[PDB]
Ligand binder design. Structure first.
Ligand SMILES: N[C@@H](CC(=O)O)C(=O)O
Ligand SMILES: N[C@@H](CC(=O)O)C(=O)O
Ligand SMILES: N[C@@H](CC(=O)O)C(=O)O
Length: 302
């Protein structure tokens, strides 16, 4: 596994998030390195899931292509017969660095950020369900009465959040205050379009994507909106097994239930520095491979 990248200053670090290590390539370009780190109950595990970051990078490359005629993205075009390493300083091709970067890294253009977590919900679950049970609203938005847990909304809904800085669920009106009325409306409409297309596809493959979180940027030189993070993975979305879907109850987490159940059984939920046992690592890894193969139609290792 690649847990924490160590590039010895060859590129400056921009950020280390829960999963991605982000480096600055040059004035206009970033390198997004998806590590094998995994979180549960909003803490990072001590150890990693081998090749998780490769699988999730590739899954997202699949979705960018799937959506190529629907939305611009931040990827830098890599010329035919070249690799990312041709676009990086020579030292990063040395074995000690190439091993940390190969297959899990994306070269991306910097863009003007739109500072919103653009969540679209197709189904009522998570924090939305919690709110709804108490007050009959979702992100302050009035909902129909009688929704059951995990039920589909009449139409998928834009339900923005800030970024922590935990994240705060906000209304569309607040999003308009933050980023502008016109821009927020356009972001909302686009995100719902992208979500619906991908949710429908995934459902025919057997996975219900209950919700997903996008991040967008803008081209100030055209007003165009651009995806500025990778999309539609189990880290950015709530995946459920479609065959087992049943309203009125919670769904197993497609990706993380095995891990969550182990943590819960040991009173380790929310605890930092927790090493997952090998059987939990292996099974979680296998579940990422199954997600990847199911959604992309490609084979991981054959
Ligand atoms: N999605 C993770 C959230 C986290 O632990 O950061 C979970 O399934 O519990
Ligand atoms: N590759 C373009 C985006 C696009 O092709 O739509 C860019 O990096 O800005
Ligand atoms: N109509 C918006 C502009 C935007 O789309 O950001 C406003 O100035 O509030």
């Amino acid at each position: 596994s690649i847990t924490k990248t160590e590039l010895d200053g060859i590129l400056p670090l921009v950020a280390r998030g829960k999963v991605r290590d982000i480096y600055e390539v040059d004035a206009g370009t970033l390198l997004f390195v998806a590590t094998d780190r995994i979180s549960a109950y909003d803490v990072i595990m001590e150890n990693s899931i081998p090749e998780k970051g490769i699988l999730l990078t590739k899954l997202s490359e699949f979705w960018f292509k799937f959506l190529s005629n629907d939305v611009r993205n931040h990827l830098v075009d890599i010329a035919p017969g070249k690799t990312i390493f041709d676009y990086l300083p020579a030292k990063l091709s040395e074995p000690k660095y190439k091993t940390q970067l190969e297959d899990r890294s994306l070269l991306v253009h910097k863009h003007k950020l739109i500072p919103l977590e653009v969540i679209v919900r197709g189904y009522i679950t998570g924090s939305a369900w919690k709110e709804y049970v108490k007050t009959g609203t979702v992100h302050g938005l009035k909902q129909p009465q009688g929704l059951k847990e995990s039920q589909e909304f009449p139409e998928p809904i834009f339900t923005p959040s800030t970024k922590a800085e935990h994240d705060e669920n906000i209304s569309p009106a607040q999003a308009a205050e933050l980023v502008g009325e016109d821009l927020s409306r356009r972001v909302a409409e686009l995100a719902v379009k992208l979500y619906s297309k991908c949710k429908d596809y995934a459902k025919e493959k057997g996975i219900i994507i209950a919700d997903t979180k996008f991040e967008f940027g803008i081209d100030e030189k055209t007003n165009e909106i651009i995806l500025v993070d990778e999309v539609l993975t189990p880290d950015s979305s709530r995946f459920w097994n479609g065959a087992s879907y049943k309203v009125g109850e919670s769904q197993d987490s497609y990706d993380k239930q095995f891990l969550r159940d182990w943590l819960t059984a040991n009173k380790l939920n929310g605890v930092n520095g927790v090493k997952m046992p090998q059987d939990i690592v292996d099974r979680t890894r296998a579940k990422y491979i199954e997600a990847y193969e199911t959604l992309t139609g490609s084979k991981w290792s054959h």
